[PDB]
Amino acid sequence: LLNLVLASQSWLKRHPWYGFGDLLSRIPQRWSYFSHDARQLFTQKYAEIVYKIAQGFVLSKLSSKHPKLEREYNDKKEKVVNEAFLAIEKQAFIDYFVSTLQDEFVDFAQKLFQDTDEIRSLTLLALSSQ
Amino acid sequence: EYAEIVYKIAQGFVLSKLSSKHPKLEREYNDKKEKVVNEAFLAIRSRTEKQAFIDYFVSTLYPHVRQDEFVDFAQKLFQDTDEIRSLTLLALSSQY
Amino acid sequence: REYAEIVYKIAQGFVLSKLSSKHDLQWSKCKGNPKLEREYNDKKEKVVNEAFLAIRSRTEKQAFIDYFVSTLYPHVRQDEFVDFAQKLFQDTDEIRSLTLLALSSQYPIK
Amino acid sequence: NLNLFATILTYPAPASNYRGESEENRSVIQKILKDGQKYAIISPESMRNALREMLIELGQPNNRTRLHSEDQLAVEFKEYPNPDKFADDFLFGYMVAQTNDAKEMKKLNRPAKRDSIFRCNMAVAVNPYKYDTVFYQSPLNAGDSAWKNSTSSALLHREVTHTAFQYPFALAGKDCAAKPEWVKALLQAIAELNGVAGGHARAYYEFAPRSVVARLTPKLVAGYQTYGFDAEGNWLELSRLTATDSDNLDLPANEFWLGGELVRKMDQEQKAQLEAMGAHLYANPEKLFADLADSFLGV
Amino acid sequence: NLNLFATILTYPAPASNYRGESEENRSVIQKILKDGQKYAIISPESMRNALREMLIELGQPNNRTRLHSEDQLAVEFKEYPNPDKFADDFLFGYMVAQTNDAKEMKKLNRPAKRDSIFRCNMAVAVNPYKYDTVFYQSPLNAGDSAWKNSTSSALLHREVTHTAFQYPFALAGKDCAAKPEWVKALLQAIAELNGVAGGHARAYYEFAPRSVVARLTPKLVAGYQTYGFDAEGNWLELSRLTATDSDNLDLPANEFWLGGELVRKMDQEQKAQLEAMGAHLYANPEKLFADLADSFLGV
Amino acid sequence: HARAYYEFAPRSVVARLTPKLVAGYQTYGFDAEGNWLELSRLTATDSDNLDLPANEFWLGGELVRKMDQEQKAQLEAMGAHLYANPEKLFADLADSFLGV
DNA sequence: TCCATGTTTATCACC
DNA sequence: ACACAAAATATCCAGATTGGGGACACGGTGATAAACATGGA
DNA sequence: AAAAAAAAAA
C-alpha cells in the first residue's frame, strides 16, 4: 500500500515488499502456507507447471504402496522455508520429480540455469507436496 | 543459446538410447525406463562432485549417434563446465 | 583454442584413415545404389563396433601401459608432428578426458 | 597448576562410518572438506561415548547406561547427577533443561553445573578420495517363514576409504578429592579407544595410537598447529627445531614428550643429538602415558 | 606520545563460534557479505570478555565477575561490591539513572561516563564456507528415571567450517597514568587468547598468534590496510617496506616488528630487511610482545 | 564508538584545477574500489591532453604505483605527478598554493 | 518589563 | 648385396531384483536516559 | 509408439 503512494507510475507491478517485511517478522511473528506463495515472486527477482509435477510424484508414491496431517504439513514446510530464507542439493529433489514425469520443456533449461533461480527460485513450489 | 543447445543434445542422446534399446507393451516399455533412470542416476552419482571429469566418462560409455558438427559442440563446454549435470537426466522424462 | 581444434582435426583424420584401411575412399562407389549404400553402411557399423571396443578399453586406459597402446593407435597422420607431440606431454592427466571425447567422433555410422 | 595437551594418529586401514542417511540406495561418509578436497569425517562427541563405555570395565561408577528396549533409541539415568558422590561419569553432572524445580540447588546446593575439564575436536583424514563401492545385495526370505522383512530383494552399495587420521585433545585441568585416581584411569583408558563410531561387525577398525606427542605440560597454553603431523610422515621434529628450539641460546624451549613410532625409525645419531635438555623418548605409547600421568598428577 | 597498533592471525582449524539461534533444526553462525561471498564473524564483545577473564586469571585486582546461578544471563561483581574506584583497564564503567550513589558526585568525584582506553575491531575470516557440513543426534530422554522428561526423541544437525582468521587492534600512547604494571599485563595476556569462543567442549579453538606487525611512528594511524589479508601466510606490503632510507623515503622502516612465520620463510630479502635499520626480525611472538612492552612503557 | 573502530586513511587523494570555480569531474562517480578514477576522468584527460590542462591537473590514484606506472609517467603529462606518500604530496601542494 | 504550570482508557477478523 | 609378396568371412550376452521400520528439540529474557513553550500586571 | 550423409599438401 505504501509502495503505490517518472519511474513510479507502474512500479506496483514488481511491488518489492520482501526486504523490510521479512526481517522484522523473523523471530516474533514466526509463530505457513498462507505466506508460502508470497515469497515465490520475490525469489525470481512457470508456477502451475511445478504444482502438477509435485502432485504426480506423491500420487505415484502412494499408488505403488497401495486428520492431523495439516499440523504436520505446517511444520514440514516451515523447516525448509526458514532455511530458504537464510539462503539469500537444490537440483536433487527436482531431479527425481522430473524423472517421475515440448516447448515449455525447452523453457525449463533457460529458466533454471540462472544462478539466482538456482539459489532460491526452484525450491519453493515443490515443498507443498510433502 | 547454451541452454537450448544442451536441451536439444540431451534429447538427442535420450532418443538414440531408446532407439538402441529396441496394447499393454507400450506401458511396460515406459515402465521399465522409469527405473532405468534410477539405476543410471546412482551410477552417475558415484562421480567427482565437480563432475567436470565425470561427464566426459559418462557420455563416452553412453551410446551416441551424432551431435551436429562435433567440433563446435565440444569446444564451447570447456570454458563453462560444471553445468551439464543440471539437465543430464531431465531429458529422458520427455521421452515417455 | 588451437589445441581443441587440432585434436578434433586429428580425430577426423583418424576416422578417414580407418575408412581408407577398411576400403577405398571413393564414396561415389558407396552411393548411387541401395545395395552399395547398405554394404557401405554395414562396413560403417563394423567400424563402429571397433570404436566401441576402443571406447570400452579407453575407460581402463589411463595411467601407463594402456597409455602406450593408446599412443600407438591414434593414427594421427599430422602435417607438423613436432607441435602435436610436444603439446600432449605436459597435460598428462586431462588428455585422457579430452581424447575420449575425440574418440567419440569415431561414430559416423549410417 | 600445569596444563597439558597432546595429539595422536592411528594406523592405516579401510574404514567406514555411515552417518549421512542421504537415501535408501546409498550411504555417505563425508562430513567436511578443505581447499576443494573432501577430507574429514570425525564427530568430536562419539569419542566421549567410547570413553564413557570404557570407564566401566576399569571399575568406575556410571549413570548413563545406554539401553536398547524401546523402538526409539534411548538412555536411562541414576537417581541424580552428583559430582561428589561418585565418578559422575568423570565429573559430568550436567544441566537440567526443565522448570520442574525440586533441583538439588534447593536442598543439596548443586548448581546444575559441570566439571568439564576435558576438551577435544573432530578427527580429520589425510586422503581425499572417497568414491568406491562394494555393490552387495539384500535378499528376501519368502521361505514359508513366520515373518517377512521387506517383501523384496534389493541391490545396494556401501562406501569405503583407506586412510589413517589424526586426533588432537587437551585437558588443562586440575585435581580435587578422589579425582587423581579417576584422571589416572582416564589417561590409562585413552590408550586403547576401541569400538569408536558404534559397533562394526563388517568394518573392523581400531584407534591404537602411534607417534603420540604431548606439548608444554608445565606452563600455560602456548602450543601451535595441533594438526601439525600428517602426510604419513613426522612433522614435530622440524617444528621443535623451528619454534622453541632445543638450544637455550636464542630460542628457549620446554620439556616435551614423544611417542614410539617417530623414534622407531629415525636417525640413530639424531637421538644423541636431540639430548640438550634430555627431552623424553619412549618406544611404546603406554609407558609414555603412564610416566606423563605420574609427572603431571604430581604423584 | 607513542601510539601503537597491530594485526594478528591464528592457525587453521574448525570453527568454534556457534551462535545457534536460527531454529530448532539448525545451528547457524553469524555471517558477513564480502564481495558476494559469506565470511565468518566473531564480535568484539567475546574478546573483551576473554580479556577480562584472563585479567582475572593473572591475580590482578578486579571489579566484575559472573555467577552462573540465575535463570538468565547475569553479572554480579560488576556493580554490587564496587564504587568504580579503579576498573580493570581503567574503563570506569557507567550507568544512567535518576541517582547513582548520589549521582557518584559527593562520595567519589568521578565523571558519570567512562573512559574506554582500549580499542578493538571485528574479526573476519579469510576464505568462505560451503553450506551445511556436519550431522548430529540427541538422546530420547532420561528413560527409566523421571527427572529430565524432555519427551523429545529429536534428531538435528549443526554447522561447522574450517578457516583461520585475523583481526586488528590499537592502543593509544598518551595514556600513561598508573601504566607501568597495569597495561603491560594486558599486553602480555594478548599473547594467549585461549578461551574466546561460544563453546569449547567440542570445538576447542585457540587464538594463538602466528604473525604480528605492531609499530609505526609517533603519530596517528596511517591505515596501511589494517585488515591485511596476509594471503594465507604472505604479506602484501613487502614492497611498501623495502625502502628503509633512500631518496624517495616513501616508508618508515625504522619502526617495525615482524612475527614468527614472516621470518621463518628465510630469503635474501629477509637479510635485506635485517641490515635495514629498525626491522627487528623476531621468531617468538611472546618475547616480541615483552620487548615491545619494555620499549614502549619504560622507554 | 571505541570498539569496531573505523578510521579514514587517505589513499589516492587526487584532484587539482585551474584558478576557476569547481567543474570538470563532479567529484563523484567511482566504482567499488576496483578502478575508480580511470573511467571517471582519465579517458577525458587523455582525449583532452591539450584541452583540459594536465600540466596543473596532475595524475590520479596511488594505484599507479602498482600497475601501468611508466605509461602514466610519460604519455600523460610532464606535471608534478609524484605519488609516494600523501603527506609530502600535501606538503608541496601547500607550498605551491602559498607561493602564488 | 518577568512570574507563573502540567498527566489518568484496558483488546480480537481466518482456514 | 638385387626382385617379388605382408591377410580373407561369420559373431561382440540373454532374466530377475533397486530397502524396509522409528524419531526431526527442550526454557529464560527480548532496552534504559538526558536534550520546554507560552501567558498577564 | 518414432529414424538422418563425403574429402588433403612440401
Q: Which of B45, B48, B49 sits opposite D26 (nearest CB)?
A: B45
- The residues of A between 6 and 65 with beta carbon within 7 Å of nucleic strand G are 33-34
Tell me how far apart the alpha carbons of residues D212 and D288 are, in angstroms, rounded to a whole number.
9
Element (H, E) at F88: helix F86-99
Range 79-98 of A in CB contact (< 8 A) with B: 91, 95, 98
Tell me how far apart the alpha carbons of residues E216 and C90 are, in angstroms, rounded to a whole number.
48
Q: How many CB atoms lie within 10 A of CB E212?
A: 22
Tell me how far apart the alpha carbons of residues D84 and E213 are, in angstroms, rounded to a whole number.
49
Contact (Cβ atoms closer than 8 angstroms) between residue E265 and residue E234: no
| SS3 labels along chain C | CHHHHHHHHHHHHHHHHHHHHHCCCCHHHHCCCHHHHHHHHHHHHHHHHHHHHHHHHHHCCCCCHHHHHHHHCCCCCCCCHHHHHHHHHHCCCHHHHHHHHHHCCCCCCC
According to DSSP, the residues that pair with E258 across neighbouring strands are E213, E281
Element (H, E) at E33: strand E31-34
Instruction: Tell me chain C's radius of gyration from C-alpha atoms.
Output: 15
Alpha-carbon distances of E297 from D137, E175, E182, rounded to whole Å: 75, 10, 11
Contact (Cβ atoms closer than 8 angstroms) between residue E5 and residue E171: yes
Q: How far is the CA of E104 from the C1' of G2 (A)?
A: 36
Element (H, E) at D53: helix D46-54
According to DSSP, the residues that pair with D210 across neighbouring strands are D9
According to DSSP, the residues that pair with E124 across neighbouring strands are E41, E166
In angstroms, the first-to-last Cα distance of chain C is 30
Burial of residue E172 (CB within 10 Å: 0-12, 13-18, 19+) is middle
Q: How many CB atoms lie within 10 A of CB B46?
A: 13
Tell me how far apart the alpha carbons of residues D165 and D41 are, in angstroms, rounded to a whole number.
9
Neighbours of chain D (3+ CB pairs under 8 A): B, E
Residue numbers preceding breaks in chain B (C to N > 2.5 A): 22
Show residues of chain F in contact with E170, CB under 8 Å: 5
Length of chain F (residues) = 100
**Is A86–E22 a contact, with Cβ atoms under 8 angstroms apart?**
yes
Q: Is the CB of C80 under 7 A from strand I?
A: yes
Length of chain C (residues) = 110
Contact (Cβ atoms closer than 8 angstroms) between residue D292 and residue D5: no
Would you put residue E158 in left (φ > 0), alpha (ψ -120 to 50) or beta?
beta
Residue of B nearest to A115 (CA): B83
**Is B70–C5 a contact, with Cβ atoms under 8 angstroms apart?**
no
Tell me how far apart the alpha carbons of residues A39 and A33 are, in angstroms, rounded to a whole number.
11
Residues with Cβ within 8 Å of C74's Cβ and at least 6 positions away in sequence, in order, are C10, C14, C99
Helix C34-59 vs helix C65-72: angle between axes, to the nearest 10 degrees?
160
Contact (Cβ atoms closer than 8 angstroms) between residue F17 and residue F60: no
Tell me how far apart the alpha carbons of residues C105 and C74 are, in angstroms, rounded to a whole number.
13
Show residues of chain E in contact with D98, CB under 8 Å: 148-150
φ and ψ of A40, to 5 deg: -65, -45
Of E1, E37, E35, E30, the C-alpha closest to E16 is E30
What is the bridge-based pairing of β-strands E4-8 and E37-42? unpaired
Cell 542417511 locates to D21
The single-letter DSSP state of residue D284 is: S
Q: Is the CB of C20 under 7 A from strand I?
A: yes
Closest nucleotide (C1' vs CA) to B65 is I4
The single-letter DSSP state of residue E28 is: P
Contact (Cβ atoms closer than 8 angstroms) between residue E253 and residue E203: no
Chains B and C lie in contact, requiring 3 or more CB pairs less than 8 Å apart: yes
Show residues of chain E in contact with D72, CB under 8 Å: 140, 153
Long-range contacts of E146-151 (CB under 8 A, 24+ apart): E147/D77, E147/D80, E147/D96, E147/D100, E148/D77, E148/D96, E148/D97, E148/D98, E149/D98, E149/D100, E150/D97, E150/D98
Q: How many CB atoms lie within 10 A of CB E258?
A: 23
Neighbours of chain E (3+ CB pairs under 8 A): A, D, F
Q: Is the CB of B30 under 7 A from strand H?
A: no
Alpha helices in chain E (DSSP H): 44-57, 179-189, 261-264, 268-275, 285-293
DSSP per position, D136-175: EEE----SS-S--SSSS-EEEB--BEEE--EEEEE-----
Q: Dig out the grid coordinates for D291 from the structure.
A: 610416566
Q: How far is the CA of E98 from the C1' of G3 (A)?
A: 29
φ and ψ of D212, to 5 deg: -80, 140
Contact (Cβ atoms closer than 8 angstroms) between residue A95 and residue B90: yes
Q: How far is the CA of F87 from the C1' of H11 (A)?
A: 89
Tell me how far apart the alpha carbons of residues F74 and F71 are, in angstroms, rounded to a whole number.
6
Q: Dig out the grid coordinates for E38 from the structure.
A: 559469506
Contact (Cβ atoms closer than 8 angstroms) between residue D122 and residue D168: no
Tell me how far apart the alpha carbons of residues A45 and A48 are, in angstroms, rounded to a whole number.
18
Cell 586422503 locates to D127
Tell me how far apart the alpha carbons of residues A18 and A120 are, in angstroms, rounded to a whole number.
14
The single-letter DSSP state of residue E276 is: S
Contact (Cβ atoms closer than 8 angstroms) between residue E239 and residue E262: no
Q: How far is the CA of E97 from the C1' of G9 (A)?
A: 29
Q: Dig out the grid coordinates for D73 from the structure.
A: 533409541
Contact (Cβ atoms closer than 8 angstroms) between residue A89 and residue A61: no
Q: How far is the CA of E99 from the C1' of H40 (A)?
A: 38
**Is E221–F7 a contact, with Cβ atoms under 8 angstroms apart?**
yes
Neighbours of chain A (3+ CB pairs under 8 A): B, E
Residues with Cβ within 8 Å of D181's Cβ and at least 6 positions away in sequence, in order, are none
Show residues of chain E in contact with A82, CB under 8 Å: 22-23, 26
Is the CB of D37 inside 8 Å of chain B's CB atoms?
Answer: no
Burial of residue D263 (CB within 10 Å: 0-12, 13-18, 19+) is middle
Tally the C-alpha atoms within 13 A of residue B67's C-alpha that lie toward its C-beta: 26
Helix B2-21 vs helix B70-79: angle between axes, to the nearest 10 degrees?
120
Q: How far is the CA of A27 from the C1' of H28 (A)?
A: 16
Residue of B nearest to D38 (CA): B49
Tally the C-alpha atoms within 13 A of residue E139's C-alpha that lie toward its C-beta: 18
Q: How many CB atoms lie within 10 A of CB A108?
A: 21
Is the CB of F2 inside 8 Å of chain E's CB atoms?
Answer: yes
- 3-state secondary structure (DSSP) of residue A44: helix
Element (H, E) at D183: helix D179-189
Contact (Cβ atoms closer than 8 angstroms) between residue D166 and residue D7: yes
According to DSSP, the residues that pair with E4 across neighbouring strands are E171
Of D231, D207, D224, D170, the C-alpha closest to D285 is D207
According to DSSP, the residues that pair with D170 across neighbouring strands are D5, D119
Show residues of chain A in contact with E25, CB under 8 Å: 79
Show residues of chain E in contact with F84, CB under 8 Å: 248-250
Q: Dig out the grid coordinates for E3 from the structure.
A: 601510539
Alpha-carbon distances of C1 from B69, C4, C49, C52, F8, rounded to whole Å: 16, 6, 31, 28, 47
Q: Experimental method used, please?
A: cryo-EM
Tell me how far apart the alpha carbons of residues A110 and B2 are, in angstroms, rounded to a whole number.
8
DSSP per position, E51-105: HHHHHHHTT---S--B---SSS--B-TTTSS--SSS-SSS------SS-STGGGT
Order of strands, edge to edge, in the sheet holding D5-10?
D119-120, D166-170, D5-10, D209-215, D257-258
Contact (Cβ atoms closer than 8 angstroms) between residue E175 and residue E116: no
Tell me how far apart the alpha carbons of residues E90 and E116 are, in angstroms, rounded to a whole number.
8
Tell me how far apart the alpha carbons of residues E25 and E136 are, in angstroms, rounded to a whole number.
10
Tell me how far apart the alpha carbons of residues D130 and D28 are, in angstroms, rounded to a whole number.
9
Q: Which of F3, F7, F84 sits opposite E250 (nearest CB)?
A: F84
In angstroms, the first-to-last Cα distance of chain F is 42
According to DSSP, the residues that pair with D162 across neighbouring strands are D14
Closest Cα of chain A to E24: distance in Å? 9
Alpha-carbon distances of C41 from B15, B20, B60, rounded to whole Å: 21, 16, 22
Residue of F nearest to E117 (CA): F2
Tell me how far apart the alpha carbons of residues A72 and D215 are, in angstroms, rounded to a whole number.
53
Cell 554447522 locates to E159
What's the one-letter identity of residue E61? P
Tell me how far apart the alpha carbons of residues D168 and E125 are, in angstroms, rounded to a whole number.
23
Is the CB of C109 inside 8 Å of chain B's CB atoms?
Answer: yes
Closest Cα of chain C to B38: distance in Å? 23
Of E120, E163, E145, E129, the C-alpha closest to E38 is E129
Tell me how far apart the alpha carbons of residues E198 and E96 are, in angstroms, rounded to a whole number.
30
Tell me how far apart the alpha carbons of residues C81 and A76 are, in angstroms, rounded to a whole number.
64
Is the CB of B71 inside 8 Å of chain C's CB atoms?
Answer: yes
Contact (Cβ atoms closer than 8 angstroms) between residue D224 and residue E210: yes
Alpha-carbon distances of A118 from A35, A84, B86, rounded to whole Å: 21, 12, 10
Tell me how far apart the alpha carbons of residues E25 and E141 are, in angstroms, rounded to a whole number.
18
Tell me how far apart the alpha carbons of residues D116 and E68 are, in angstroms, rounded to a whole number.
15
Closest nucleotide (C1' vs CA) to A33 is G15
Q: Is the CB of D71 under 7 A from strand H?
A: yes
Of D236, D200, D182, D246, the C-alpha closest to D9 is D236
Q: How far is the CA of B42 from the C1' of H17 (A)?
A: 16
Closest Cα of chain E to D299: distance in Å? 25
**Is B46–D38 a contact, with Cβ atoms under 8 angstroms apart?**
no
Length of chain B (residues) = 96
Q: Dig out the grid coordinates for E282 from the structure.
A: 623476531
- The residues of E between 56 and 75 with beta carbon within 7 Å of nucleic strand H are 71-73
